[PDB]
Design an enzyme around this catalytic site. Structure first.
Site, mmCIF file in Angstrom:
data_model
loop_
_atom_site.group_PDB
_atom_site.id
_atom_site.type_symbol
_atom_site.label_atom_id
_atom_site.label_comp_id
_atom_site.label_asym_id
_atom_site.label_seq_id
_atom_site.Cartn_x
_atom_site.Cartn_y
_atom_site.Cartn_z
ATOM 1 N N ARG A 1 3.084 11.473 3.761
ATOM 2 C CA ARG A 1 2.729 10.644 2.603
ATOM 3 C C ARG A 1 1.435 11.147 1.954
ATOM 4 O O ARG A 1 0.473 11.455 2.654
ATOM 5 C CB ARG A 1 2.514 9.184 3.033
ATOM 6 C CG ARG A 1 3.726 8.494 3.621
ATOM 7 C CD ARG A 1 3.453 7.027 4.014
ATOM 8 N NE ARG A 1 2.399 6.894 5.029
ATOM 9 C CZ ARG A 1 2.013 5.744 5.583
ATOM 10 N NH1 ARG A 1 2.596 4.603 5.245
ATOM 11 N NH2 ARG A 1 0.990 5.723 6.430
ATOM 12 N N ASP B 1 -5.706 -1.378 3.882
ATOM 13 C CA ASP B 1 -4.516 -1.768 4.621
ATOM 14 C C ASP B 1 -4.005 -3.153 4.218
ATOM 15 O O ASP B 1 -4.656 -4.167 4.472
ATOM 16 C CB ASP B 1 -4.733 -1.711 6.131
ATOM 17 C CG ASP B 1 -3.433 -1.906 6.909
ATOM 18 O OD1 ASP B 1 -2.379 -1.410 6.438
ATOM 19 O OD2 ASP B 1 -3.450 -2.562 7.973
ATOM 20 N N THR B 2 -2.888 -3.178 3.496
ATOM 21 C CA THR B 2 -2.264 -4.435 3.112
ATOM 22 C C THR B 2 -1.404 -4.828 4.316
ATOM 23 O O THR B 2 -1.001 -3.960 5.116
ATOM 24 C CB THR B 2 -1.366 -4.281 1.860
ATOM 25 O OG1 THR B 2 -0.462 -3.180 2.031
ATOM 26 C CG2 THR B 2 -2.203 -4.051 0.638
ATOM 27 N N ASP C 1 0.755 -1.243 0.000
ATOM 28 C CA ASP C 1 0.000 0.000 0.000
ATOM 29 C C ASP C 1 0.794 1.307 0.000
ATOM 30 O O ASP C 1 0.194 2.384 0.110
ATOM 31 C CB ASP C 1 -1.013 -0.009 1.156
ATOM 32 C CG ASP C 1 -0.353 -0.129 2.517
ATOM 33 O OD1 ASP C 1 0.869 0.099 2.611
ATOM 34 O OD2 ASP C 1 -1.059 -0.452 3.499
ATOM 35 N N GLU D 1 1.638 -5.853 6.857
ATOM 36 C CA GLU D 1 2.986 -5.371 7.103
ATOM 37 C C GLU D 1 4.078 -6.362 6.701
ATOM 38 O O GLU D 1 3.918 -7.580 6.835
ATOM 39 C CB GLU D 1 3.137 -5.073 8.590
ATOM 40 C CG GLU D 1 4.390 -4.311 8.950
ATOM 41 C CD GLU D 1 4.410 -2.948 8.309
ATOM 42 O OE1 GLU D 1 3.470 -2.153 8.549
ATOM 43 O OE2 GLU D 1 5.358 -2.683 7.543
ATOM 44 N N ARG E 1 0.432 6.620 -0.027
ATOM 45 C CA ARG E 1 -0.176 5.586 0.787
ATOM 46 C C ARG E 1 -1.601 5.532 0.271
ATOM 47 O O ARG E 1 -2.277 6.550 0.195
ATOM 48 C CB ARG E 1 -0.161 6.014 2.263
ATOM 49 C CG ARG E 1 -0.931 5.118 3.247
ATOM 50 C CD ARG E 1 -0.368 3.707 3.279
ATOM 51 N NE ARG E 1 -0.938 2.898 4.355
ATOM 52 C CZ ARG E 1 -2.132 2.305 4.321
ATOM 53 N NH1 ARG E 1 -2.929 2.414 3.264
ATOM 54 N NH2 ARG E 1 -2.523 1.578 5.354
HETATM 55 C C1 LIG Z 1 -4.478 5.259 4.956
HETATM 56 C C2 LIG Z 1 -4.147 6.240 6.111
HETATM 57 C C3 LIG Z 1 -3.136 6.002 6.975
HETATM 58 N N1 LIG Z 1 -2.941 6.804 8.070
HETATM 59 C C4 LIG Z 1 -2.030 6.501 9.187
HETATM 60 C C5 LIG Z 1 -2.689 5.729 10.300
HETATM 61 C C6 LIG Z 1 -1.545 4.892 10.751
HETATM 62 O O1 LIG Z 1 -0.664 5.636 11.621
HETATM 63 P P1 LIG Z 1 0.063 4.960 12.919
HETATM 64 O O2 LIG Z 1 1.429 4.776 12.455
HETATM 65 O O3 LIG Z 1 -0.130 5.975 13.952
HETATM 66 O O4 LIG Z 1 -0.673 3.692 13.196
HETATM 67 C C7 LIG Z 1 -0.731 4.587 9.521
HETATM 68 C C8 LIG Z 1 -1.209 3.332 8.786
HETATM 69 O O5 LIG Z 1 -0.416 3.132 7.620
HETATM 70 P P2 LIG Z 1 0.541 1.901 7.394
HETATM 71 O O6 LIG Z 1 -0.323 0.745 7.004
HETATM 72 O O7 LIG Z 1 1.443 2.296 6.282
HETATM 73 O O8 LIG Z 1 1.139 1.748 8.713
HETATM 74 O O9 LIG Z 1 -0.879 5.780 8.725
HETATM 75 C C9 LIG Z 1 -3.583 7.981 8.211
HETATM 76 O O10 LIG Z 1 -3.125 8.864 8.934
HETATM 77 N N2 LIG Z 1 -4.658 8.189 7.394
HETATM 78 C C10 LIG Z 1 -4.974 7.420 6.281
HETATM 79 O O11 LIG Z 1 -5.915 7.758 5.554
HETATM 80 CA CA LIG Z 2 -0.121 -1.316 5.686
#
Ligand SMILES: Cc1cn([C@H]2C[C@H](OP(=O)(O)O)[C@@H](COP(=O)(O)O)O2)c(=O)[nH]c1=O
Ligand SMILES: [Ca+2]
Length: 135
Positions: A81, A34-35, A15, A37, A29
């Site tokens: 991102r 959510d794919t 993702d 980790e 992103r």
């Molecule tokens: C898709 C997305 C991710 N995120 C944030 C939430 C998560 O932060 P935290 O690091 O605080 O959990 C993280 C999830 O992405 P990843 O799957 O790349 O981790 O990015 C947002 O802020 N808004 C969004 O719309």
């Molecule tokens: Ca992810």
């Protein structure tokens, strides 16, 4: 929503990827999904992570055209991102992964949810077909 051209720089995982947008490189992103980790030690290499990464990579690497589509709310998350729906030859990567059972609909933050229902119907389909994540 308006689609805008972009150029793939590097696929990172299922993702997240780096693209050349408006003359500058940025990591993107995918919105609403959510794919699994494959990087972060706190989560380790989750199941289907490597798979979701392979699916996305193939999809964006073999495309003639890539387009980014920002939603109506904020365009970047806290890590800088860009947040968008990415299209590879007119096919939305976000939806494709969900439909394959390689991503879950997640991080639905209003008002960045324009395609929420579309992605949900595809996820319910992947679920009832018990695909990958849902098996
Ligand atoms: C898709 C997305 C991710 N995120 C944030 C939430 C998560 O932060 P935290 O690091 O605080 O959990 C993280 C999830 O992405 P990843 O799957 O790349 O981790 O990015 C947002 O802020 N808004 C969004 O719309
Ligand atoms: Ca992810």
């Amino acid at each position: 929503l308006h689609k805008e051209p972009a150029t793939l720089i590097k696929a990172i995982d299922g993702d997240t990827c780096k693209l050349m947008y408006k003359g500058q490189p940025m990591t993107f992103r995918l919105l609403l999904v959510d794919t699994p980790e494959t990087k972060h030690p706190k989560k380790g290499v989750e199941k289907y992570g490597p798979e979701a990464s392979a699916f996305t990579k193939k999809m964006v690497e073999n495309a003639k055209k890539i387009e980014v589509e920002f939603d109506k709310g904020q365009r970047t998350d806290k890590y800088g991102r860009g947040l968008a729906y990415i299209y590879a030859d007119g096919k939305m990567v976000n939806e494709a992964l969900v439909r394959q059972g390689l991503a879950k609909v997640a991080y639905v933050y209003k008002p960045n949810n324009t395609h929420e229902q579309h992605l949900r119907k595809s996820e319910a389909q992947a679920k009832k077909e018990k695909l990958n994540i849902w098996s």
